Amino acid sequence: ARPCIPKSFGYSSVVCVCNATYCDSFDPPTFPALGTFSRYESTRSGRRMELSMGPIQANHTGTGLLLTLQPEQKFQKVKGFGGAMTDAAALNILALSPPAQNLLLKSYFSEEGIGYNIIRVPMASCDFSIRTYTYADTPDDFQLHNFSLPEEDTKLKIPLIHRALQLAQRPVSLLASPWTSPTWLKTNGAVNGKGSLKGQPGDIYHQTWARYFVKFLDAYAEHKLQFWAVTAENEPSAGLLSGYPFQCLGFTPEHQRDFIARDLGPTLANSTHHNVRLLMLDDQRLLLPHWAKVVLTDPEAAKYVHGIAVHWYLDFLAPAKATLGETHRLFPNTMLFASEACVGSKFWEQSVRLGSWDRGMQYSHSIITNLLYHVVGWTDWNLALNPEGGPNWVRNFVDSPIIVDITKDTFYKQPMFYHLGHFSKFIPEGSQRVGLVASQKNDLDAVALMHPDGSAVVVVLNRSSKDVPLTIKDPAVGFLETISPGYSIHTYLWHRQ
Amino acid sequence: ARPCIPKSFGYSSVVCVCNATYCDSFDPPTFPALGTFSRYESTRSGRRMELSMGPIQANHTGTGLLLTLQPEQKFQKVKGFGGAMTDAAALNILALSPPAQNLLLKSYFSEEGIGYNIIRVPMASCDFSIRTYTYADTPDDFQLHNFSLPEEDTKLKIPLIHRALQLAQRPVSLLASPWTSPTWLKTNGAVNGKGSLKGQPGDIYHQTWARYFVKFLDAYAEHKLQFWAVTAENEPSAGLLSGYPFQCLGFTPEHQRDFIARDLGPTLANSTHHNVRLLMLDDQRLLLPHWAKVVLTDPEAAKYVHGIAVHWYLDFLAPAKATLGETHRLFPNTMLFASEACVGSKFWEQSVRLGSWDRGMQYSHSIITNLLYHVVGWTDWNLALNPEGGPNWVRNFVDSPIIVDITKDTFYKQPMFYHLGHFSKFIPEGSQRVGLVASQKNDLDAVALMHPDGSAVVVVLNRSSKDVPLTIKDPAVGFLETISPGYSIHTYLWHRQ
Amino acid sequence: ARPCIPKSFGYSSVVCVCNATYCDSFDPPTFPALGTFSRYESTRSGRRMELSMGPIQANHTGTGLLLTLQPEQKFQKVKGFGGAMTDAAALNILALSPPAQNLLLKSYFSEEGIGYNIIRVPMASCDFSIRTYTYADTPDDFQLHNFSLPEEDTKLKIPLIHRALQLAQRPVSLLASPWTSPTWLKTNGAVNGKGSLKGQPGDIYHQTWARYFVKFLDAYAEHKLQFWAVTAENEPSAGLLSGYPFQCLGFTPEHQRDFIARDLGPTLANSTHHNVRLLMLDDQRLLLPHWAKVVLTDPEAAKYVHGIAVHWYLDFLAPAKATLGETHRLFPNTMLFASEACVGSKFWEQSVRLGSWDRGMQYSHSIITNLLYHVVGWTDWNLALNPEGGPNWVRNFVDSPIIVDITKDTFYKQPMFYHLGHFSKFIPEGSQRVGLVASQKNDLDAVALMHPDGSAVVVVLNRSSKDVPLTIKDPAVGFLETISPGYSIHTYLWHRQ
Amino acid sequence: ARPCIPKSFGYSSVVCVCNATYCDSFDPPTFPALGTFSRYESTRSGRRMELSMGPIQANHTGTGLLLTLQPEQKFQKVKGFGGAMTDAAALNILALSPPAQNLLLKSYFSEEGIGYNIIRVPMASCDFSIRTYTYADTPDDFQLHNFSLPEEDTKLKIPLIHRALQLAQRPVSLLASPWTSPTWLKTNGAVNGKGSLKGQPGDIYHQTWARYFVKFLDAYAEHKLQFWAVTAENEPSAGLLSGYPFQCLGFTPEHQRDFIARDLGPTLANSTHHNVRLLMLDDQRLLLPHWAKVVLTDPEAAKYVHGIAVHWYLDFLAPAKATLGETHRLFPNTMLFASEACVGSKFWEQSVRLGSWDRGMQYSHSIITNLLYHVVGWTDWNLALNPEGGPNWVRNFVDSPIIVDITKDTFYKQPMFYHLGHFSKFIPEGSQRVGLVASQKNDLDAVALMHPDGSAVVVVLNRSSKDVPLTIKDPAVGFLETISPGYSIHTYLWHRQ
Numbered sequence A, B, C, D: 001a002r003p004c005i006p007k008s009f010g011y012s013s014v015v016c017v018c019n020a021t022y023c024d025s026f027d028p029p030t031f032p033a034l035g036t037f038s039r040y041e042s043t044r045s046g047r048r049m050e051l052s053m054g055p056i057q058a059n060h061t062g063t064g065l066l067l068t069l070q071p072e073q074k075f076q077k078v079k080g081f082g083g084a085m086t087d088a089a090a091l092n093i094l095a096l097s098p099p100a101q102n103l104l105l106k107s108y109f110s111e112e113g114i115g116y117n118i119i120r121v122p123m124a125s126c127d128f129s130i131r132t133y134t135y136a137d138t139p140d141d142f143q144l145h146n147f148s149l150p151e152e153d154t155k156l157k158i159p160l161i162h163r164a165l166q167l168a169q170r171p172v173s174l175l176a177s178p179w180t181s182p183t184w185l186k187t188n189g190a191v192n193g194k195g196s197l198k199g200q201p202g203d204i205y206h207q208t209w210a211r212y213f214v215k216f217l218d219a220y221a222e223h224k225l226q227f228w229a230v231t232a233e234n235e236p237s238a239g240l241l242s243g244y245p246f247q248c249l250g251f252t253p254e255h256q257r258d259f260i261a262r263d264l265g266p267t268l269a270n271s272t273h274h275n276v277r278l279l280m281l282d283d284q285r286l287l288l289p290h291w292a293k294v295v296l297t298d299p300e301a302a303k304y305v306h307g308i309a310v311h312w313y314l315d316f317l318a319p320a321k322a323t324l325g326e327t328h329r330l331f332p333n334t335m336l337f338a339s340e341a342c343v344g345s346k347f348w349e350q351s352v353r354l355g356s357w358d359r360g361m362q363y364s365h366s367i368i369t370n371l372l373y374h375v376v377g378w379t380d381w382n383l384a385l386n387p388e389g390g391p392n393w394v395r396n397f398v399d400s401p402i403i404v405d406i407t408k409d410t411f412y413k414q415p416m417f418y419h420l421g422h423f424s425k426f427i428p429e430g431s432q433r434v435g436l437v438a439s440q441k442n443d444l445d446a447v448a449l450m451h452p453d454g455s456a457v458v459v460v461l462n463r464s465s466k467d468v469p470l471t472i473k474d475p476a477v478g479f480l481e482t483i484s485p486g487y488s489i490h491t492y493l494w495h496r497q
């Protein structure tokens, strides 16, 4: 169906412009006939998940790069891919007119879009908020008698979450993370700054904070929304830092272990939302494997933890092997999951660059590394942001795949959107990553998986400027001859039988 | 009856701290025999509307500046003083515990406070809201069948206004201003930006818009609330700039004239709400006399306009004589009314500065200038904000007389609150401005008025660092020997017989 | 001609891209033949000062809008047009390769560019500096023994001014303004803040500050640069404001008058630079006429003041007539001159909008209004800035006609460049503004002038979206039949005898 | 000799205030008989390198943590400690009066100070410069006939270096690093941005770049200055990132390897500067082991490389063992050297925080880690900055141990300065690191070394708030009983014979 409408804003590539009557979209997905493959391609020069098809050949000779599928070499199963319905995202998406709202959400959740099946929902405010509430701001309300959802949940977040789940055919999983507790639970009595929960695990502060999770879940449930998982805390390590600028609650690894063991675990387990999964960490991967060891080598915490959630920000100084690889090595039965990423973020980095192809490649590059080191899902931060990278109450502006221009009733799908979509669209839940051996060294990032149904998907990213010819070999069926254009991303799909 | 608990946040003066169980207040007001006066004094060093009394003597001991009351020189009568019940004010007030809410409302509205008698009510969202909405967002509802009040009005604003009116002895007048129409009535299909109504005065867009005012007043009346006056649009000049960041609807002085003549006047006059006054402009005074020349020289428009509303905003605006005074010269029978002021702000300054004497002095200096140029009322912007100048979906750029810290169930009454009250408390509705002649050039700002019962009120602001020896003469009573200290504001009240 | 090479960044219009080998330029200037006129046209839709010619007709019929020249009604003679060589502008310029530096300079200063003949030069640092510094930072150095120029002058500004002057055919006039004195001369001991010169006019602080001007001139003279004029102070009113964020030195109008009379006037007179002119004010036109009355009615200050300089930032609260008009009325023989303007200065306002036509129109609209009220020249602020609108040590970033992209070795000429050039290129020094009566109300902005040689220039701006057919009538020659397209600026030139 | 004059600027500890006539200093250093130790102590509460002496006893009365010297366990020898004479440092130091310049230089370089013995020198401009420039900006001077030292070198940098060496009793080693080449050697023809050399190693560009290094070394040699070493490029990885803001010149580890092999090693070997050592990397340590494996396993490259230079960047950075420790294991005979450290972001803290104890601890913590992982030297960034962290032509983002306030002819010594001196003062060149075994898990950071003459030195950092009881055992002498106060740093020195 409708192709991308490009616009340039002076960066390395175009955005696709959507408005109330128009937005680029896909035909209903089909599988290629046996003997043939599907290819989706996006390029710096302006191609956007464009479909073509070719034959799978019985024969290959040559000495080009060859990537061989190893279907018998099974690794992790995939959970999925999505983004965060923060107060900022929900507010920008609802400031468009109704028809443009639907196109924005179809872009993400529809099979005519990119098939998101994760939404991370913050528990009360974060920096991507326009004020600093919590759900229990009445001081010393240890019974949480005055716990309630503000309009940010009931008017913004929740309605849009329902609207998304209605557009998706895949089941979608919700993931909640808190940034701060009520201030009267905290040693410093502020939403920000250095400060943790008062007292010691097992006590009334810790028991209240754990009941707060259940009240959150109870409230979302009145609104007919169920969670797949919760994290123990957003970036617990942030709250150990003096002058930390926005909402945070600090835990040392040991504090997190004992809060889970004493309070959060038992309290969740004793409640009707006992099937909600718990993920620890929810922080930079530099803190691994150590935080995993401290928590998971204690069997009283360990029985309550489904998985470890990682944020990407320090990936660059934390090699995947030493962090993710090792963690998996030690706790192979405890899933690794990526719960948050953005560009950028860093003091040198400018916030939103409309049309940036470099940012797109950062995303797919980090997705491919994640999948090659055991990680079962990948989750972007804000679903949508304004051209400033906000709102953000503390001016901590960042970039997002969809940029909303409220004065235009229009939105811009960035390269970050399409680079993500190269995975989210073609790797349903249950996909199992498999082996893929390169015949010689190369500058490509490639990853192979199998869908629950047996069929193959391979993603290939080219971040160097030169076209690279390659053959994908699958012994069940044959050879795929193709080229990786420079600054391209490709997904290949084929039936195996 | 209870004194100010001062607190310093490191600016030039203190705030007054209030909480669920304590707030500063006044005894019922009570005034002495002929020959005696009352002085209420607030200083930068900490005095807050403190009362003393003294003699009005027949012998003149002062050899300094003399201010002589000239009761026969008679000017405008006063409508009153108030502030705006924006979504932001309501949300801040409603996040205090109910005893703290009552103390807050009594501070403004009761005789034990500063005696407000004006509330401004936005019609649907503005920047001081946590979301975008109008009362009719279901597209092309040209008969306004789906017009309704959201929760902002039914849960937050309306109960708060009901409670203000119960606490008030004085009759309270409500004033209403739209920021935006439904976006389907708009050139640009956007709640913000450069964008006016579709079509031309008299057509179906323009009739629908005008009907929206009647549906508005209908709705509030169903809630037992009646308006004194509506404005023709908040800040119509802003709807003609750029991608104006907040909710707006642009009108040229011409387009307002025609909308008033063809649509809004006709529609209002046709309804039960025909007694509601219509105010034009609602914008910076730089736009006068020109806007008034445009609208009011049209008999078809002018028969429906009861006054001209002006914004102060306040870092900032035009000379008074050339704008306010010239407008009064040309149209002496159309009242002038200040419908919105705010401060700073002010790129090198906080939105909120707790204890800023200077932002207080700015309020009183401007109310005085206003009174001296035929303005009949002055109404503040947001009644309350948080310590960030929020919530504001776009950006905070302004202070408020009261700052709520909900995490501590506390509120702070800023020096601005007391500069407002030095007028609002002691200048009831119907009071008349009268002459007051200075005997020599001086630094003070002074205004004299007469109460409906003929008693005298004089306010004196000293914005300089120096104590000014002062004498006030009432021809009918005598000489009041006094001193205006540096950085103070005084209100003198005395019986004339 | 090399034509404009356009680029969009998503705003209303295009920039013209220039690099080390290419930059849009004009052919050498020519007179249109008697009986013919020349037209230069710039439009929103992409035309950049492009030349055509048409006939001057013997007669006219219509009914249409007729602008009639009144050659015998004569007003001010023009000094010229230009911009500021700040530390920021100089730094951005000299960060391009040498051949790109000369293209940028030829753009402004040569006949194949837009013929600038004013350069405003800061005396030390302002906000558009990357450090605060004065020429005399050794504390208490009343003799100015350690006065010297830093590299900001000797390596950046000076060499770039020598180059500009070499590229200009027209004589260029240098105008200097100080933001701060050494901090030891100031009551507050800081470069910024509220604070003025210590002591009293006539005294050592004041005499030293006046000798610093002569030492500035001495130093520039050593480097073969001569000044046309100095202002008494950049924005003297900013030093009267508490917490003023960057470099400033406060003067009341009375302190200004008295410093000129006692110190700066005599000190410049007794020096070899006695022919350098002195302009007072160098601040917002709101301060007029009062600042003018206070200074110029003192014959001892008056004998030293050649002119009054005005900045544009508060033009919009200060109708031109009340300020510029009244001041000229009171002091017809003391020239008015616009010495600084920029856009993006509010909050509200974004900083750099690459290719913004609105900002372009804001510049031309202000130049016409200035020329219609007696003003003899107009000076832009920074000559060039980076795409963030800096550098600026205090982050007070703004727009500029030329934006330098150091990383691409490229520069962008904005719509503001072309809008200024429709004036600077065509109105040499000595042009006298003359009458131009319109036949009916219109939405156009127009101004006529006569070159020294006796020929005619008319500039016409259309800020409405509507094409407006007009006839210009000169009685010496005939009718020019034309159209003013919407969002266009035109210059018309013709010989008269 | 003279004690610290403290001043608080509202951070966690004091600065020590120096001017033209006073600065804190040390007596010439002097050490007691066998059986007695010296302790220099600095505390957050205000103690600054305070000296006391005590006994080393036969009897062990301590029951807490024991640290036992292990002199026979012998590690790397130390090259030294210093910082960078950038343009920004030089500009700050010389805007002080001569007497204050000498007290600043004696602070760092004399034994009455902290005995620096390393100065790093930028080759032409970097971000800590007030203008862009190289030594060869005349385009296409491939024999570099137009190679010259600007005033930054000949006026600022060189005389200051000369005076540092006059003041030093220790011999000082100079380290040179380039940021960018002349831009006509650059793929991108820009001073910053994503750009490398043109062409390929061996060619005309690369031989020109290599010769540039010799030209530099010839020039400084004419000013009677010789280099210890040069680095192959400052932060080579920075110039592989799209539009990098500061001067860079990108090399992949491969291009560095070939540039060293083909061009730089060969040219230097063939010159009179063949003794100048060459350090590779000069970048973040996250780039190790990889960068070292690429360059050092190529024998044509390795013959030419004396060491690997690392940046500490410093509110990040990668784990020590896997970078520095693994690099030592793989290439045990190639020295590691810390060539640049600084603090800091993060985005919510000032560039400069005057008296920030935490920042001091960061210096000492990270020096100790260095030492514990085979690093032979540690060299600070800018020696001095202004109170803004400037001048920086791009953006201030880092602090400095000495902050200069020129307007008051004063300088401020940071905690960071003293945290550095606890090493640089007491660990002379040729000291060897030795074993020091902790008896139990503890919080302190501790390192032991031996002077060339056999005497012992141990430094103990307490980054926690609790006092830690401490015994230090020397097998040859006995037990030194002591306390490591909360937030202290200690240097102990003793004769072993």
Ligand SMILES: *[C@@H]1O[C@H](CO)[C@@H](O)[C@H](O)[C@H]1NC(C)=O
Residues within 6 Å of the ligand: A005, A018, A019, A020, A021, A022
């Ligand atoms: C929306 O986009 C389409 C595709 O470019 C265009 O034809 C249409 O005019 C747009 N509608 C609006 C309201 O801009």
Ligand SMILES: *[C@@H]1O[C@H](CO)[C@@H](O)[C@H](O)[C@H]1NC(C)=O
Residues within 6 Å of the ligand: B005, B017, B018, B019, B020, B021, B022
């Ligand atoms: C409220 O204010 C009063 C007077 O300042 C004080 O005594 C009281 O403790 C406050 N209440 C609380 C909960 O702090």
Ligand SMILES: *[C@@H]1O[C@H](CO)[C@@H](O)[C@H](O)[C@H]1NC(C)=O
Residues within 6 Å of the ligand: C005, C018, C019, C020, C021, C022
């Ligand atoms: C300079 O611009 C011209 C005109 O567009 C173009 O042909 C050329 O590519 C540019 N040169 C460089 C170095 O980019």
Ligand SMILES: *[C@@H]1O[C@H](CO)[C@@H](O)[C@H](O)[C@H]1NC(C)=O
Residues within 6 Å of the ligand: D005, D018, D019, D020, D021, D022
């Ligand atoms: C320099 O410092 C010393 C030590 O505080 C002090 O007594 C002296 O006044 C200072 N000199 C100046 C110019 O303040």
